[PDB]
Design a protein around this ligand. Structure first.
Ligand SMILES: COCC(CCO[C@H]1CC[C@@]2(C)C(=CC[C@H]3[C@@H]4C[C@@H]5O[C@]6(CC[C@@H](C)CO6)[C@@H](C)[C@@H]5[C@@]4(C)CC[C@@H]32)C1)COC
Ligand SMILES: COc1cc(Br)c(C[N+]2(CCOCC[C@@H]3CC[C@@H]4C[C@H]3C4(C)C)CCOCC2)cc1OC
Ligand SMILES: [Ca+2]
Length: 1206
């Protein structure tokens, strides 16, 4: 609200003078402070260098410039973004002057990290990106109102069952001390609770603050909400589960987590993608509206024009003939002789480069040098000759040719240099150009590189914003937690806000979630213990994992949806009788249905306890059953390739007579039902096509990992070798023994032996680098920091194109996959009634129960109950528990009132005729039974209460619709769901049979809580791997050499492991992306709709208004509609304030009405007429055009007695 106090002059006319010069110096000051907050090293205690104090000095210049600017601009006016300036200044000068005499800014001076926001504010280049980002999150606020609901429901349920049970721990050795359990202490359970039982001479006893310093316990509510949150982010969900499993037994803890994950992450994860993608498409559409794609095609056609007449200017000297040389080189460049030859020289040169390996003899070193020397001469002559034939200009024009020239110059440079080793290696890394000069598989290579340039160029500004955000947080990190990480442990923390470099690293790790929850603890245990004010440090490590990851996802998607696409665009008779009748069909479906359970249910540990034992006979019998499947065999043999798999499984089943591997090779039975579902008809080739696409994509990554690492060899060879004794720095020096003090105990000398060892990720040869590169997918700073960044790029590049080729590849799936729908909701739609009270008493209550207020009150009471179950700590004064129980009684009683009232405002059937009403009924009865039991399992009848909260979700249209929609599409994902369960099942039986008897050792990863001995536990282990939870280690635990279990009676743990787990991870990821894509695509109408124009949801309102003015199940409205016709019409539909008594009536009578009586016209007439006015318009004569159009097209000519219009 501009004051417009235009007091003549000298108000403004100061910053008005030299706008651009004065604006810039402020921006330069901002950039100087962004580089001033990144020096001050934050320190232990109060020590300071000269610079720090000297930067506090220049903060007294940045706090005289920002104040004169502020006041001079105030004089002008005295809005939004400028508020940031004002608050930063206020807090600033303040803080200082306050502290001026004080000589604990921290917080008070941890605000200046908000100054780099003025970098966004001033520069308008990314300010638009910030509005786009902000304006894209507006739709997905319903999803932020639901992630919160799931968390709350889960936290509440959780504190109720598992709170306070995690406090024991094997606490001794029948002597006197502390948790002995190695280190890892894990809730233990007394000899009566079926939890872990403690062994040896250990004893369980109360104490142990917690599972993990007390911050991973459902004790108390806040710890509970936070635990659930850390838990849904799939960052150690298995661990919380194991601690809980240890404390309360293993039977029911798991259901609660599997759900939390499936309903919390997979389901919730999809919505954000669906909401975000729909938004991108809207933007993509606006962009298409621009016509840019067509313009880009015209630019490429211009490019081929300059080439196609570049050959013409080349020929221009043919009539001007020196000339001979020109003609020769022209033929050459065209002559394949040059092409194939040069391609060959590439690979061979490529070879030379890879040849380099540590400890290389001259046999190699000599050869490499000799080759390069000549190979380099080769490329030169060729490029040089290609210069003349081609048009110098156009030759330099083609990006690739230009890069070629650049790198040949690199060779010249390195040669004249030889006339540091690192620099030479770098130049040779540059020479990997030719390596890809051949443009192998350019079909993709070219597109990916071209796209890569386009893609990277496209998201420049978004990347800028990401970087600004990261820098801001890192500065806050060093200010907030910097210096507070001295926990007095020689333990080396990779994550520490000691300095900005590390600060950035910590932030990135948190963003990547490598150990982000762990980093939380550092701060939340730094500033203070796991107490009250010591947790307001966590409110930070989240704001970074949601916001950062949000921006990160926004930036990615863009790559995809917004580029890839733009870029990519007698006896036999009777036999049939029986074998066609249900019996020899739906019945057989059963004979395998439960037969499949045979492999699913088996004892794969103990030898032949009846259990395992007898199960052989059933196999035998199902197999005689498959012989019977021979009576059906020649019935009509030579959809039967399925029948050959029946033949094979049947034969190996009879082959079970005396055989092992074959036995375990019987899981094909499960797949005998999968065919039946695709047989629900509705492609095999498409599947094959998808598989081919996937394989192809594997190869791109593979070759990249090759070239990237051939870079590593040249750069890191021989710089990881080291000795155990840090003092020694030469292989020769490292010979003998040294002394190590356990945990830095001066009184704990340990005579270890010195050894010269190469570190992990040994780039000693292309090969090891190769596998390490896989290892990242599957010292501290000696030279590590550098390697670090190398181990971040393979990533970027990898994803960058693994996605590019794939998601863009997919869309064809979408190719395969409003006015009409609105017509069909106007036609083929019937009006509804509403229960009216037939009795006076039945009525008063009705008015009330339906009185809006009553609903208002109900919700208030609901909030209160949950605010009464939330407060349940670990140690609550008994008075308090009594209070809580009495309160629950009051609440249950109040809900009884409503149930009974409603049943007296709506007849029994009416109340019960509504799902929500029945839900309420159930909650109430169960809650009352709980009350009874208490006044007197029990716990189950208690959780109930909490659930009610859900009914608060059956409210806002925004949230109601989204869920309903996706739920209304979580059935059209069958084929990508049966497929997934099939996977789990098969892999599990297989697994339980090979990696099964591996003995269980709590110290390893095949512990009693993640074993492979009962179908259920194996499916849980596979779900962990799928959820990407350290699947790796489980895998290592399944390699040969593990001892066989005692009941099994080291011949165990077959090597197949790698194939299994890796194959599993891969297949799972795919099937899952297929799931998400399937869902969203199928529901891609809601995910993108111009709510402005008319849709169905904008149309149902008419029924709820019409029935409001309509007694029974009726139609045939009275003429007194003259009021309601526009009484309450959504302005998108009709008018909103315009005089109702306008032509509105004359026009509604203007079109002909159906030849009915005075009051025998349906609601369909008014509805469809309003829709028509709301949609495409037509004139007279077109009356019949419209009529025939309706009864020829919209659901074809669905016969309708639509007499006259509408
Ligand atoms: C009705 O049909 C309309 C259809 C609309 C076109 O749909 C586009 C919308 C984006 C969409 C659905 C498309 C392709 C792959 C989809 C992606 C797979 C990736 O998977 C993820 C999962 C999570 C990430 C870790 C990796 O990538 C998502 C980010 C990514 C994803 C789900 C984002 C959405 C993408 C194309 C056109 O029809 C011809
Ligand atoms: C109703 O008819 C149907 C229509 C469609 Br579309 C589908 C879905 N399908 C299956 C989706 O994935 C099939 C491709 C493969 C299935 C196995 C995994 C992941 C991927 C496969 C590559 C490894 C049918 C096959 O091609 C199109 C996609 C199933 C139907 O049921 C037969
Ligand atoms: Ca992880």
């Amino acid at each position: 609200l501009c004051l417009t106090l235009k007091n003549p002059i000298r108000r403004a006319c100061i910053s008005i003078v030299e706008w651009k010069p004065f604006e810039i110096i402020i921006l330069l000051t901002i950039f100087a402070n962004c580089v001033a907050l990144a020096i001050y090293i934050p320190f232990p205690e109060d020590d300071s260098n000269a610079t720090n104090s000297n930067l506090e000095r220049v903060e007294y210049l940045f706090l005289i410039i920002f104040t004169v600017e502020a006041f001079l601009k105030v004089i002008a006016y005295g809005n939004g973004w400028n508020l940031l300036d004002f608050i930063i200044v206020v807090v600033g000068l303040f803080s200082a002057i306050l502290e001026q005499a004080t000589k604990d800014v921290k917080a008070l001076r941890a605000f200046r990290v908000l100054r780099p926001l003025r970098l966004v504010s001033g520069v308008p280049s990314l300010q638009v990106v910030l509005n786009s980002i902000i304006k894209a999150m507006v739709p997905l606020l319903h999803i932020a109102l639901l992630v919160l609901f799931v968390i709350i429901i889960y936290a509440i349920i959780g504190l109720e069952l598992f709170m306070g049970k995690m406090h024991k721990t094997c606490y001794n050795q029948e002597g006197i001390a502390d948790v002995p359990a190695e280190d890892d202490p894990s809730p233990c359970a007394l000899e009566t609770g079926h939890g872990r039982q403690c062994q040896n001479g250990t004893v369980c006893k109360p104490g142990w603050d917690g599972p993990k310093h007390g911050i991973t316990n459902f004790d108390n509510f806040a710890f509970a909400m936070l635990t659930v949150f850390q838990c849904i982010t799939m960052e150690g969900w298995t661990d919380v589960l194991y601690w809980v499993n240890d404390a309360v037994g293993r039977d029911w803890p798991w259901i609660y987590f599997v759900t939390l994950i499936i309903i919390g992450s997979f389901f919730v994860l999809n919505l954000v993608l669906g909401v975000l993608s729909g938004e991108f498409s809207k933007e993509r559409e606006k962009a298409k509206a621009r016509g840019d794609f067509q313009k880009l095609r015209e630019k490429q056609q211009l490019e081929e024009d300059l080439k196609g007449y570049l050959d013409w200017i080349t020929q221009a000297e043919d009539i001007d003939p020196n000339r001979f040389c020109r003609r020769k080189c022209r033929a050459a460049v065209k002559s394949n002789v040059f092409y194939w030859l040069v391609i060959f020289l590439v690979f061979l040169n490529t070879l030379t480069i890879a040849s380099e390996h540590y400890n290389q003899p001259n046999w190699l070193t000599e050869v490499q040098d000799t080759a390069n020397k000549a190979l380099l001469a080769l490329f030169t002559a060729e490029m040089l000759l290609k210069m003349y034939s081609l048009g110098l200009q156009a030759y330099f024009v083609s990006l690739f040719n230009r890069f070629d020239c650049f790198v040949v110059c690199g060779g010249i440079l390195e040669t004249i240099l030889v006339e540091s080793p690192l620099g030479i290696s770098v130049l040779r890394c540059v020479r990997l150009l030719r390596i890809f000069k051949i443009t192998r598989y350019w079909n993709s290579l070219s597109n990916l590189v071209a796209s890569l340039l386009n893609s990277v160029r496209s998201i420049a500004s978004l990347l800028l914003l990401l970087f600004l955000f990261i820098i801001i947080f890192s500065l806050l990190g060093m200010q907030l937690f910097g210096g507070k990480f001295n926990f007095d442990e020689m333990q080396t923390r990779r994550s520490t806000f000691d300095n900005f470099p590390q600060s950035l690293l910590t932030v990135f790790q948190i963003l990547t979630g490598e150990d982000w929850n762990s980093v939380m603890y550092d701060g939340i245990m730094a500033y203070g213990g796991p107490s009250f004010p010591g947790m307001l440090v966590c409110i930070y490590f989240i704001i970074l994992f949601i916001c950062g990851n949000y921006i990160l996802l926004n930036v990615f998607l863009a790559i995809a949806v917004d580029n890839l696409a733009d870029a990519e665009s007698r006896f036999r008779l009777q036999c049939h009788r029986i074998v066609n009748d249900t019996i020899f069909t739906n019945l057989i479906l059963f004979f395998i249905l439960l037969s499949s359970i045979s492999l699913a249910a088996e004892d794969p540990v103990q030898h032949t306890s009846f259990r395992n034992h007898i199960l052989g006979n059933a196999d035998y019998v199902f197999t005689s059953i498959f012989t019977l499947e021979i009576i059906l065999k020649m019935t009509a043999y030579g959809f039967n390739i399925l029948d050959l798999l029946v033949v094979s499984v049947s034969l190996i089943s009879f082959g079970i007579q005396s055989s092992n591997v074959v036995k375990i090779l019987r899981v094909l039975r499960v797949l005998r039902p999968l065919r039946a579902i695709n047989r629900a008809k509705g492609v095999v080739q498409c599947v094959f096509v998808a598989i081919r696409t996937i394989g192809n994509i594997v190869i791109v990554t593979t070759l990249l990992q090759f070239m990237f690492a051939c870079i590593g060899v040249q750069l890191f060879k021989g710089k990881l070798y080291t000795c155990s004794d840090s003092s020694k720095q030469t292989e020769a020096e490292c010979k003998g023994n040294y002394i190590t003090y356990k945990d830095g105990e001066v009184d704990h000398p340990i005579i270890q032996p010195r050894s010269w060892e190469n570190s992990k990720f040994d780039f000693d040869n292309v090969l090891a680098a190769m596998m390490a590169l896989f290892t990242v997918s599957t010292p501290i700073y000696n030279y590590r920091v550098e390697i670090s960044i190398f181990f971040i790029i393979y990533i970027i590049i990898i994803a960058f194109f693994m996605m590019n080729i794939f998601v863009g590849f997919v869309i064809v799936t979408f190719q395969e996959q409003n006015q009409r729908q609105c017509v069909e909701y106007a036609l083929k739609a019937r009006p509804l009634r509403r229960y009216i009270p037939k009795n006076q008493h039945q009525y008063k209550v009705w008015y009330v129960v339906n009185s809006t207020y009553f609903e208002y009150l109900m919700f208030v009471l609901i909030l209160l109950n949950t605010i009464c179950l939330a407060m349940q700590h670990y140690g609550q004064s008994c008075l308090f528990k009594i209070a809580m129980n009495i309160l629950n009684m009051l609440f249950t009683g109040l809900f009884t009132v409503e149930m009974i009232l409603k049943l007296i405002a709506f007849k029994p059937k009416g109340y019960f005729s509504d799902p929500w009403n029945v839900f309420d009924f159930l909650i109430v009865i169960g809650s009352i039974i709980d009350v009874i039991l208490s006044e007197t399992s029990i716990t189950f009848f208690r959780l109930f209460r909490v659930m009610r909260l859900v009914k608060l979700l059956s409210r806002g249209e925004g949230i109601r619709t989204l869920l309903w929609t996706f739920i209304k599409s979580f059935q059209a994902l069958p084929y990508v769901a049966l497929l997934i369960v099939m996977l789990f099942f098969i892999y599990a039986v297989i697994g339980m049979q090979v990696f099964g008897k591996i003995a269980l050792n709590d110290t390893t990863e095949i512990n009693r809580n993640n074993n492979f001995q009962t179908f259920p536990q194996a499916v849980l282990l596979l779900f962990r791997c799928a959820t990407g939870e350290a699947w790796q280690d489980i895998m290592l635990a399944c390699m040969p050499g593990k001892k066989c279990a005692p009941e099994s009676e080291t011949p165990c743990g077959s090597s197949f492991a790698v194939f299994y787990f890796i194959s599993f991870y891969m297949l799972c990821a795919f099937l899952i992306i297929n799931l998400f894509v399937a869902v969203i695509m199928d529901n891609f109408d809601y995910l993108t709709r111009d709510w402005s124009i008319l849709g169905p949801h904008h149309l149902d309102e008419f029924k709820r208004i019409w029935a409001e003015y309509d007694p029974e199940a009726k139609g045939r409205i009275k003429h007194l509609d003259v009021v309601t016709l526009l009484r309450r019409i959504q302005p998108p539909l009709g008018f909103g304030k315009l005089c109702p008594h306008r032509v509105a009536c004359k026009r509604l009578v203007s079109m002909n009405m159906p030849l009915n009586s005075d009051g025998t016209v349906m609601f369909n007439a008014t509805l469809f007429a309003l829709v028509r006015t709301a949609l495409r318009i037509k004139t007279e004569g077109n009356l019949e055009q419209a009529n025939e159009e309706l009864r020829a097209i919209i659901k074809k000519i669905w016969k309708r007695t639509s007499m006259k219009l509408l």
